[PDB]
């Protein structure tokens, strides 16, 4: 059915199998898109928009800045952070989640 971008990313980030093109940095709810093109490809495939690329997917993320859902991490290419309360929404502390996903600290 209907899916929002932040929710899609959230699906990928909770699937160990996707950690090669998208993953958690290790600092709270921050995450990095190591392969933007791949993420855009799947996003395009999910929404049925063949011509979808990162250039456009990023515009969607920028719409969240004002809505306090996702913020950009300054200076770090392809790095954003969920700024909404994912703990209340999912019931897991950044660590518990990181554990279940076997997250290794990023820097």
């Amino acid at each position: 059915g209907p899916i929002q971008l932040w929710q899609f990313l959230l699906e990928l980030l909770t699937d160990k199998s996707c950690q090669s093109f998208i993953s958690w940095t290790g600092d709270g709810w921050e995450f990095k898109l190591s392969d933007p093109d791949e993420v855009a490809r799947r996003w395009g495939k999910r929404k049925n928009k063949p011509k979808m690329n990162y250039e456009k997917l990023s515009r969607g993320l920028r719409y969240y800045y004002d809505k306090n859902i996702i913020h950009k991490t300054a200076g770090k290419r392809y790095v954003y952070r969920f700024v909404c309360d994912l703990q209340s929404l999912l019931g897991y502390t950044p660590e518990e989640l990181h554990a279940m996903l076997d997250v290794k600290p990023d820097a």
Binding site: G1, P2, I3, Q4, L10, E11, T14, L89, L90
Partner: protein, 142 residues
């Protein structure tokens, strides 16, 4: 009536002393108007006199506008990029109230002036569950 830059650009208000731009019957909210909304004064109104516009109807006693205030200059108050943020309701339009801040103040109205919508004029068309389960519920919320 025919003291406007172009044909059918101005219309009369419920008051004999003022005229204002003709507004699109339906427009998209937060979108710049096709023409610059003006309020023309027939009588003598000093340069600098403020003019405001309020939109409203049964749905919205008052609707959020942007740039709804302009200064009168040479009998004309030219709003720069006036916009409508608040919607008017399905199949409904806003009445505009023009207040010209002379002393005493003067009110002019433009009834059923414009309908505002999000699209605007448009071309015809125990127990514990997992993440997948949690995410799915979250994706349906609304």
């Amino acid at each position: 009536e025919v003291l406007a830059d172009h044909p059918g650009e101005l219309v009369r208000t419920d008051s004999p002393n003022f005229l204002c731009s003709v507004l699109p019957t339906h427009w998209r909210c937060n979108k710049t108007l096709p023409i610059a909304f003006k309020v023309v004064a027939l009588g003598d109104v000093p340069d600098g006199t403020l003019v405001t516009v309020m939109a409203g109807n049964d749905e919205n006693y008052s609707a959020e506008l942007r740039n709804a205030t302009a200064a009168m200059k040479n009998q004309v108050a030219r709003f720069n990029d006036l916009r409508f943020v608040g919607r008017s309701g399905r199949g409904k339009s806003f009445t505009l109230t023009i207040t010209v801040f002379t002393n005493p103040p003067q009110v002019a109205t433009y009834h059923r002036a414009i309908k505002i919508t999000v699209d605007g004029p448009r071309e015809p068309r125990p127990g514990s569950l997992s993440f997948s389960e949690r995410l799915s519920e979250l994706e349906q919320l609304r």
